[PDB]
Write a protein that binds this ligand. Structure first.
Ligand SMILES: CO[C@H]1O[C@H](CO)[C@@H](O)[C@H](O)[C@@H]1O[C@H]1O[C@H](CO)[C@@H](O)[C@H](O)[C@@H]1O[C@H]1O[C@H](CO)[C@@H](O)[C@H](O[C@H]2O[C@H](CO)[C@@H](O)[C@H](O)[C@H]2O)[C@@H]1O
Ligand code: MG
Length: 362
């Protein structure tokens, strides 16, 4: 079970049984800004259970994230994958992504289930409305207060010093460095440094130039999230050497994000440019290779169950309707992506042991 391997996990799926309505599965098709173009693509919400907002279909069908049994199935699959850590997509209590409902209520249950399968839960902080340095304090406080004690709560052990919580900050570049430095530097007017609320804050690097904003912000590390090789500077495999080199010089944790593929045309019909066919695992293994070549301190997987963007490694099954031939993992099995992860997790976990200075050779 590899505690250096994180996977982005979403708890925002709903269905009438547990949640009394479909949530996320019944995703609306997102309009292109330009109506001249949008009118030539589909319109409306998908109609689960047979029409979902995904190119792929799950073994668990149009499941509820709040289904105790689904959570369990999810832990089992991540444990089979040799992934120690799910990075849970998070919105403050009583707040939600624009196409979902609140999910903070469900964190306690997800922690209990991670524990049951000997897994760790860290927090992927989404761009909630008017997110800034001040409510980021209130909310880092909230996360560590309410869930910090829990045995499944994730802390990144340094060989020396306290183990520190990790916050992955999605779209960190939205907030100016001088505001971040209020929270993330020692002298910050609202610094969490050397306090009960310290942690490792990982910035999303999109453009090369964000390097310097991230340095100035006082962030501990950078990650790249996007599963499409070439989508951003940061999500392009060729640039991962440079970011590793950069982070090393500046004592930042470089966390590359690897995807098995991308396809979101079920809900962004204009976004074909960023489709990546899986070619039966070869895309995902190129990604995993490029990541391990940087001898990184952690690796992130985009994603476990982002079904809308077709980046999920969660088990998928062939399915056809009167209009739709869903993608699937044929000729391989529903677990191909869980198996390819196990393969590369064990290979990482072995090479990673030869990195430390006190474990170098003649
Ligand atoms: C132009 O915007 C995109 O690209 C920039 C970087 O150049 C990002 O900083 C933006 O956040 C944005 O990336 C998101 O959207 C693109 C599509 O353009 C997608 O390819 C990405 O993977 C990003 O969105 C996903 O991941 C984040 C993090 O977990 C999450 O907030 C997003 O949630 C949105 O998309 C869902 C459908 O895919 C939708 O249901 C939800 O309500 C949205 O907030 C995506 O999971
Ligand atoms: Mg050190």
């Amino acid at each position: 079970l590899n505690n250096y391997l994180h996977v982005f996990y979403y708890s925002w799926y709903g269905n009438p049984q547990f949640d009394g309505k479909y949530i996320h599965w019944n995703h609306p098709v997102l309009e292109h800004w330009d109506p001249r173009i949008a009118k030539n693509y589909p319109q409306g919400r998908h109609n689960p259970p047979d029409d979902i907002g995904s190119s792929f279909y799950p073994e668990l069908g149009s499941y509820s994230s709040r289904d105790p049994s689904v959570i369990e199935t999810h832990m089992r699959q991540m444990r089979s994958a040799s992934i120690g850590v799910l990075a849970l997509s998070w919105y403050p209590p009583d707040v939600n992504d624009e196409n979902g409902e609140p999910t903070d209520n469900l964190v306690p249950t997800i922690l209990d289930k991670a524990h049951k399968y000997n897994l760790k839960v860290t927090f992927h902080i989404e761009p909630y409305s008017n997110r800034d340095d001040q409510n980021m304090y209130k909310n880092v406080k909230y996360i560590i207060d309410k869930y910090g004690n829990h045995p499944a709560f994730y802390r990144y052990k340094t060989k020396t010093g306290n183990a520190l919580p990790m916050f992955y900050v999605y779209d960190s570049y939205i907030t100016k460095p001088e505001k971040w430095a209020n929270l993330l530097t020692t002298s910050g007017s609202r610094s969490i440094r050397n306090s009960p609320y310290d942690g490792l804050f990982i910035a999303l690097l999109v453009e090369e130039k964000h390097k310097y904003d991230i340095l100035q912000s006082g962030f501990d590390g950078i990650y790249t999230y996007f599963a499409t090789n070439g989508f951003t500077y940061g999500s392009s495999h060729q640039n991962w050497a440079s970011l590793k080199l950069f982070c090393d010089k500046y004592n930042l944790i470089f966390i590359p994000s690897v995807g098995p593929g991308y396809i979101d045309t079920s809900i962004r019909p204009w976004n074909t440019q960023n489709t990546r066919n899986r070619i039966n695992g070869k895309y995902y293994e190129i990604g995993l290779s490029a990541a391990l070549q940087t001898r990184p301190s952690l690796i992130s997987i985009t994603s476990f169950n982002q079904w809308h963007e077709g980046t999920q490694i969660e088990k998928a099954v062939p399915k056809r309707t009167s209009n739709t031939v869903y993608l699937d993992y044929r000729p391989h099995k529903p677990g191909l992506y869980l198996e390819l992860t196990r393969k590369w997790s064990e290979k990482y976990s072995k090479e990673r042991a030869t990195y430390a200075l006190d474990r170098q050779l003649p």
